[PDB]
Design an enzyme around this catalytic site. Structure first.
Site, PDB file in Angstrom:
ATOM      1  N   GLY A  26       0.834  -1.187   0.000  1.00 22.09           N
ATOM      2  CA  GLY A  26       0.000   0.000   0.000  1.00 22.09           C
ATOM      3  C   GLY A  26       0.871   1.240   0.000  1.00 22.09           C
ATOM      4  N   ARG A  27       0.398   2.288  -0.669  1.00 20.66           N
ATOM      5  CA  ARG A  27       1.140   3.541  -0.740  1.00 20.66           C
ATOM      6  C   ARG A  27       0.450   4.610   0.098  1.00 20.66           C
ATOM      7  NH1 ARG A  27       2.433   6.813  -6.263  1.00 20.66           N
ATOM      8  NH2 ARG A  27       3.835   8.447  -5.441  1.00 20.66           N
ATOM      9  N   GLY A  31       4.506   7.685   2.978  1.00 25.73           N
ATOM     10  CA  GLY A  31       5.500   6.764   2.458  1.00 25.73           C
ATOM     11  C   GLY A  31       4.903   5.463   1.952  1.00 25.73           C
ATOM     12  N   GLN A  32       5.194   4.360   2.638  1.00 28.20           N
ATOM     13  CA  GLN A  32       4.693   3.068   2.191  1.00 28.20           C
ATOM     14  C   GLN A  32       4.533   1.968   3.223  1.00 28.20           C
ATOM     15  OE1 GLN A  32       5.795   2.183  -2.545  1.00 28.20           O
ATOM     16  NE2 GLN A  32       7.336   1.964  -0.909  1.00 28.20           N
ATOM     17  N   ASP A 163      -9.511   6.226  12.086  1.00 29.40           N
ATOM     18  CA  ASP A 163      -9.947   5.917  10.733  1.00 29.40           C
ATOM     19  C   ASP A 163     -10.365   4.460  10.615  1.00 29.40           C
ATOM     20  OD1 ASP A 163     -10.468   6.742   8.000  1.00 29.40           O
ATOM     21  OD2 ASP A 163      -8.670   5.590   7.418  1.00 29.40           O
ATOM     22  N   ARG A 167     -11.202  -1.329   5.146  1.00 26.97           N
ATOM     23  CA  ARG A 167      -9.877  -1.319   4.535  1.00 26.97           C
ATOM     24  C   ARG A 167      -8.776  -1.316   5.593  1.00 26.97           C
ATOM     25  NH1 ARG A 167      -8.928   4.078   5.135  1.00 26.97           N
ATOM     26  NH2 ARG A 167     -10.904   5.250   5.335  1.00 26.97           N
ATOM     27  N   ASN A 168      -9.127  -0.992   6.836  1.00 23.07           N
ATOM     28  CA  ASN A 168      -8.151  -1.006   7.925  1.00 23.07           C
ATOM     29  C   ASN A 168      -8.390  -2.170   8.877  1.00 23.07           C
ATOM     30  OD1 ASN A 168      -6.540   1.187   7.173  1.00 23.07           O
ATOM     31  ND2 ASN A 168      -7.808   2.655   8.295  1.00 23.07           N
ATOM     32  N   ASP A 181      -3.909   0.058  10.558  1.00 19.42           N
ATOM     33  CA  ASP A 181      -3.989   1.369   9.937  1.00 19.42           C
ATOM     34  C   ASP A 181      -2.949   1.470   8.832  1.00 19.42           C
ATOM     35  OD1 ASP A 181      -3.748   4.879  11.076  1.00 19.42           O
ATOM     36  OD2 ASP A 181      -4.533   3.957   9.245  1.00 19.42           O
TER      37      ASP A 181
HETATM   38  C1  LIG Z   1      -1.736  -8.945   2.832  1.00 23.82           C
HETATM   39  N1  LIG Z   1      -1.335  -8.344   4.104  1.00 23.82           N
HETATM   40  C2  LIG Z   1      -1.231  -6.992   4.238  1.00 23.82           C
HETATM   41  O1  LIG Z   1      -1.464  -6.197   3.306  1.00 23.82           O
HETATM   42  C3  LIG Z   1      -0.813  -6.565   5.590  1.00 23.82           C
HETATM   43  C4  LIG Z   1      -0.375  -5.255   5.751  1.00 23.82           C
HETATM   44  C5  LIG Z   1       0.029  -4.807   7.017  1.00 23.82           C
HETATM   45  O2  LIG Z   1       0.447  -3.477   7.015  1.00 23.82           O
HETATM   46  C6  LIG Z   1       0.645  -2.691   8.142  1.00 23.82           C
HETATM   47  C7  LIG Z   1       1.973  -2.343   8.479  1.00 23.82           C
HETATM   48  C8  LIG Z   1       2.232  -1.510   9.584  1.00 23.82           C
HETATM   49  C9  LIG Z   1       1.181  -1.034  10.342  1.00 23.82           C
HETATM   50  N2  LIG Z   1       1.113  -0.218  11.441  1.00 23.82           N
HETATM   51  C10 LIG Z   1      -0.185  -0.082  11.760  1.00 23.82           C
HETATM   52  N3  LIG Z   1      -0.630   0.745  12.891  1.00 23.82           N
HETATM   53  C11 LIG Z   1      -1.650   0.512  13.763  1.00 23.82           C
HETATM   54  C12 LIG Z   1      -2.310  -0.732  13.929  1.00 23.82           C
HETATM   55  C13 LIG Z   1      -3.353  -0.860  14.873  1.00 23.82           C
HETATM   56  C14 LIG Z   1      -3.732   0.262  15.651  1.00 23.82           C
HETATM   57 CL1  LIG Z   1      -5.027  -0.015  16.787  1.00 23.82          CL
HETATM   58  C15 LIG Z   1      -3.076   1.533  15.492  1.00 23.82           C
HETATM   59  C16 LIG Z   1      -3.420   2.789  16.289  1.00 23.82           C
HETATM   60  F1  LIG Z   1      -2.804   3.865  15.782  1.00 23.82           F
HETATM   61  F2  LIG Z   1      -4.722   2.998  16.260  1.00 23.82           F
HETATM   62  F3  LIG Z   1      -3.009   2.557  17.518  1.00 23.82           F
HETATM   63  C17 LIG Z   1      -2.040   1.606  14.535  1.00 23.82           C
HETATM   64  N4  LIG Z   1      -0.986  -0.768  10.931  1.00 23.82           N
HETATM   65  C18 LIG Z   1      -0.174  -1.387  10.010  1.00 23.82           C
HETATM   66  C19 LIG Z   1      -0.433  -2.206   8.924  1.00 23.82           C
HETATM   67  C20 LIG Z   1      -0.013  -5.703   8.118  1.00 23.82           C
HETATM   68  C21 LIG Z   1      -0.467  -7.009   7.878  1.00 23.82           C
HETATM   69  N5  LIG Z   1      -0.861  -7.438   6.642  1.00 23.82           N
END
Ligand SMILES: CNC(=O)c1cc(Oc2ccc3nc(Nc4ccc(Cl)c(C(F)(F)F)c4)[nH]c3c2)ccn1
Length: 292
Positions: A26-27, A31-32, A163, A167-168, A181
């Site tokens: 994802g972009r 960044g990425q 958000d 998608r998240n 996210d």
């Molecule tokens: C086919 N699989 C995928 O496309 C994929 C992408 C992925 O990407 C990321 C990589 C780094 C990340 N960092 C986050 N941050 C994140 C995750 C959960 C929560 Cl609750 C919060 C926040 F900010 F709300 F605390 C932030 N989400 C992320 C997602 C992680 C796992 N699988």
């Protein structure tokens, strides 16, 4: 606030030279998000597939903090089954800033759900093998249940997502969903997931996340459809919304689930349910569904 959170590099810092970056996942302007390989990032494995979010080599001095906040917050929150697992990061100078999480095989829920449109029955029936690998109301109610549980947890550690959307949400192995996210909290049209208090007064609270959770439910029971289908997200949209307009029931919802969406879209933040209540109500629906 966030900037003031502790980053214990001795426990999360990971060697950039032990990561073989792969295909983009994802972009973003920040960044990425790239797929990669981590040599011994955990212990129960030698080589592990991981997901990495990183800034652009010429990223602003501002985003650099946004990404550091996310790392700190993820650390602060701690581990939970429905929150994508944080594995490590790369803060030291030399290479770009990087956060490393577990990899979720089936990716974002919106894409996934959309691909099962022609592989869904409310309830399975004998033969029962003609349905192997089909999605059912149980699956959908379960995904919602899990997300609500992860949000309750975020509430518990006093955090807000900002958000929350299909998608998240990531689908991992064994129908386990995880909140994530891909952005850094836009072609993703985020206004569709915002509560009025947020759009008009730019105010983000745990209750506005509940509004978002309502859009996510509509997303799940529309089998990945796009919020406010065909509608133009303009001045009039923000207006109608504050006037009290909501989406009609999605194609696969149940009377109760649709009512819950509405409950989440109350104009009054304090009148919206709370994730604890949602976790309780959804659990009931899950258990009520099994019966019939
Ligand atoms: C086919 N699989 C995928 O496309 C994929 C992408 C992925 O990407 C990321 C990589 C780094 C990340 N960092 C986050 N941050 C994140 C995750 C959960 C929560 Cl609750 C919060 C926040 F900010 F709300 F605390 C932030 N989400 C992320 C997602 C992680 C796992 N699988």
């Amino acid at each position: 606030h966030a900037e003031r959170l502790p980053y214990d590099a001795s426990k999360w810092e990971f060697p950039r030279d032990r990561l073989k970056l792969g295909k983009p996942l994802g972009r973003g302007a920040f960044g990425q998000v790239i797929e990669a390989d981590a040599f011994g990032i955990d212990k129960t494995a030698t080589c592990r597939t991981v997901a990495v979010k990183m800034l652009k080599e010429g990223a602003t001095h501002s985003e650099h903090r946004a990404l550091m906040s996310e790392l700190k917050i993820l650390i602060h929150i701690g581990h939970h089954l429905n929150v994508v697992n944080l594995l490590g990061a790369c803060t030291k100078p030399g290479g770009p800033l990087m956060v490393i999480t577990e990899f979720c095989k089936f990716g974002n829920l919106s894409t996934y759900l959309r691909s099962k449109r022609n592989e869904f029955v409310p309830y399975k029936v004998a033969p029962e093998d003609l349905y192997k690998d089909f999605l059912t109301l149980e699956h959908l109610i379960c995904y919602s249940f899990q997300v609500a549980k992860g949000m309750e947890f975020l509430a518990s550690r006093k955090c807000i997502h900002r958000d929350l959307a299909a998608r998240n949400i990531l689908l991992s192995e064994k129908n386990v969903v995880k909140i994530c996210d891909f952005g850094l909290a836009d072609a993703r049209l985020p206004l569709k997931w915002m509560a009025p208090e947020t759009i008009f007064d730019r105010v983000y609270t745990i209750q506005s996340d509940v509004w978002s959770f309502g859009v996510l439910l509509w997303e799940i029971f529309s089998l990945g459809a796009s919020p406010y289908p065909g509608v133009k997200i303009d001045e009039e949209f923000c207006r109608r919304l504050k006037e009290g307009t909501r989406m009609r029931a999605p194609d696969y919802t149940t009377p109760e689930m649709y009512q819950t969406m509405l409950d989440c879209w109350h104009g009054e933040p304090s009148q919206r349910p709370t994730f604890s209540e949602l976790v309780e109500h959804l659990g009931n629906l899950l258990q009520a569904n099994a019966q019939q």
